[PDB]
């Protein structure tokens, strides 16, 4: 923000604001306050406005107001990037605006992939809600409905400078996954750093995995360890599963690639850092982004679904149990255990419940009519959520059309008991639900693409006293 002093043409500055300044205004009889609107153009999926009221005397934020800032997979509704000098990834040129509007409307109507699902996390200790914004995490308190913090979790040109013109084509590191250990004292984050264009090393992505800590009183997470290129070079971490309380007191996690490799990391007190305790070889030559991972509560066994095959791996030897292999009709999008007895597996065409004790399927529900090519691989995981006491939930979003598909959507939530025998409840919300997850209490929280978080769950003196107050 630049205050031009027109008498001498000088200028005073307020830099490193959280977003580009859509609007400025001087608010007061004596100009006591400045009201600003900030945009946060990093998030291309949505227009994230933040209203800032600064005290003009010392240019300190008197009041900063914004809602939750989720990053959806694709652009929603009629979100348009602001106008810039050039057409870039974060902006539109003068000419590109109209064609961009038309192309976006046509994508929303005609195309079939309509993935707007977003990743969100819930803090077990504090019940705060974590949104992985691009290169930063928002901590948002849904009980008070206010933001509690905004922290940068990656390197990059984040708030060092305001990108302009060609610099606006740069991509900051993207926080792909963010998870908490069951204890809640450790935060595990996975990041992808993208090289700049027009260099030899312009096609080698960098994958970083980080472990952070904080005390309950504190508010800022502290990076304790950093792993560069886990699992190898240019190999993503497709799934992260924090370990159960039984094994290492929840001080461990599992990471899984698209090559079927698994790696178990744990916090070692002697080392005082996280160490790669166990490894499985991603040696066969198969690529697939549809992987899911579940862990039994006792911690004895692990369920690793790779492509169309579910594998039962012993944790102790970190290998197949000595049936281990279950073939599925199509790719596994999700595996979860409602209880230790029953394992619920979602494939791209159906949803099945299989009892481990018998090794037989109890129920199978058709998902193909609703979920055909709408979501990319791995997002049905964030649409399906699972309680540890009562039951699980399925979220199905579908377009409304009247005489060609229309932008407006309708979502339906189904509560299912363990093994999917019966539907405890069936509800309809009038708008696309991006993410539904289980609060550690009985209730479930869900996020709607209007950034709305809903929940599904179970005398003379008397005359004087008035007069004296008026005066």
């Amino acid at each position: 923000m630049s205050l031009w002093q027109l008498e001498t043409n000088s200028q005073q500055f307020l830099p490193r604001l959280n977003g580009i300044i859509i609007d400025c205004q001087v608010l007061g009889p004596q100009g006591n306050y400045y009201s600003l609107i900030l945009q946060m153009t990093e998030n291309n999926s949505n227009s994230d406005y933040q209203f800032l009221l600064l005290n003009a005397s010392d240019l300190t934020s008197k009041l900063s107001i914004n809602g939750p800032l989720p990053v959806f997979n694709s652009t929603i509704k009629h979100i348009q990037q602001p106008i810039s000098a050039m057409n870039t990834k974060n902006s539109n040129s003068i000419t590109s605006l109209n064609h961009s509007k038309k192309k976006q409307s046509r994508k929303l109507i005609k195309s079939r992939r309509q993935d707007f699902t977003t990743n969100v996390e819930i803090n077990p200790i504090n019940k705060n809600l974590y949104f992985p914004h691009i290169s930063a995490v928002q901590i948002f308190d849904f009980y008070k409905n206010e933001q509690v913090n905004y922290q940068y979790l990656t390197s990059g040109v984040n708030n060092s400078m305001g990108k302009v013109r060609f610099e606006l084509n740069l991509q900051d590191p993207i926080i792909t996954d963010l998870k908490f250990t069951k204890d809640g004292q450790w935060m595990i984050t996975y990041e992808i750093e993208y090289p700049p264009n027009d260099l030899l090393s312009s096609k080698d992505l960098t994958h970083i995995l980080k472990f952070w800590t904080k005390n309950d009183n504190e508010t800022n997470w502290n990076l304790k360890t950093k792993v560069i290129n886990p699992h190898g070079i240019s190999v993503p971490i497709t799934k992260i599963l924090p370990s159960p309380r039984s094994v290492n007191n929840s001080q461990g996690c599992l990471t899984a690639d698209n090559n079927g490799g698994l790696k178990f990391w744990s916090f070692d007190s002697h080392e005082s850092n996280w160490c790669l305790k166990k490894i499985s070889l991603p040696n066969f030559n198969h690529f697939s982004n549809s992987v899911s991972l579940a862990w039994s509560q006792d911690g004895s066994l692990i369920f690793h679904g790779f492509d169309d095959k579910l594998q039962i791996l012993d944790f102790d030897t970190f290998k197949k149990f000595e049936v281990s292999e279950f073939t599925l009709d199509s790719e596994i999008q999700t595996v979860k255990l409602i209880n230790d007895t029953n394992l619920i597996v979602a494939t791209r065409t159906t949803l099945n419940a299989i009892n481990l004790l018998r090794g037989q399927v109890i129920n199978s529900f058709d998902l193909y009519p609703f979920v055909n090519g709408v979501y990319k691989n791995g997002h049905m995981d964030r649409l399906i959520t699972c309680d540890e006491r009562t039951g699980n939930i399925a979220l199905v979003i579908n377009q409304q059309l009247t005489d060609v598909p229309t932008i407006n959507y309708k979502s339906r939530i189904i509560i299912f008991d363990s093994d999917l025998s019966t539907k405890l409840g069936n509800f309809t919300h009038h708008e696309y639900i991006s993410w539904i997850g289980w609060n550690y209490d009985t209730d479930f929280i869900f996020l709607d693409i209007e950034s709305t978080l809903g929940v599904v769950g179970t005398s003379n003196s008397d005359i004087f006293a008035e007069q004296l107050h008026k005066l």
Partner: protein
């Protein structure tokens, strides 16, 4: 801050006279770096084979760890010390097969070799660009 950076390849927590086998064995057991360096100063490949040939298999595994540390810290010693490593694997290969764990005990070698081999595709690209530009100005 003071966080520990690392990588995913660190599997640490998962016949002739003139042989210096006597000096090598003592240096390895006692962790005497100065005594070890004098042994490593020998560069005659005939000696290197013979010393490792008579060296006890158990002590060989510790020798591999030491060479991996010297190679990792000092890249210019990568050449002269590879012959030591290449003979250790050649001669005591049978012993190294019949050992409960390799990655944990040879984690230094795996990390050191992985670092070099990963640079190969980028180095070749630089070689092609340097060769192309060098040829243009020589012929002109």
């Amino acid at each position: 801050g003071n966080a520990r950076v690392t990588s995913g390849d660190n599997f640490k927590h998962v016949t002739t006279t003139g042989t210096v086998t006597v000096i090598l064995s003592q240096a390895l057991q006692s962790n005497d770096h100065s005594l070890l360096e004098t042994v490593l100063n020998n560069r005659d490949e005939r000696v290197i084979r013979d010393t490792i040939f008579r060296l006890k298999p158990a002590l060989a595994v510790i020798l591999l760890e030491r060479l991996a540390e010297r190679i990792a810290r000092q890249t210019h010693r990568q050449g002269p010390l590879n012959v030591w490593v290449k003979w250790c694997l050649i001669i005591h290969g049978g012993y190294l097969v019949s050992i409960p764990n390799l990655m944990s005990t040879l984690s230094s070698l795996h990390s050191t070799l992985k670092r070099r081999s990963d640079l190969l595709p980028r180095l070749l690209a630089l070689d092609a660009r340097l060769d192309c530009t060098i040829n243009k100005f020589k012929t002109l």
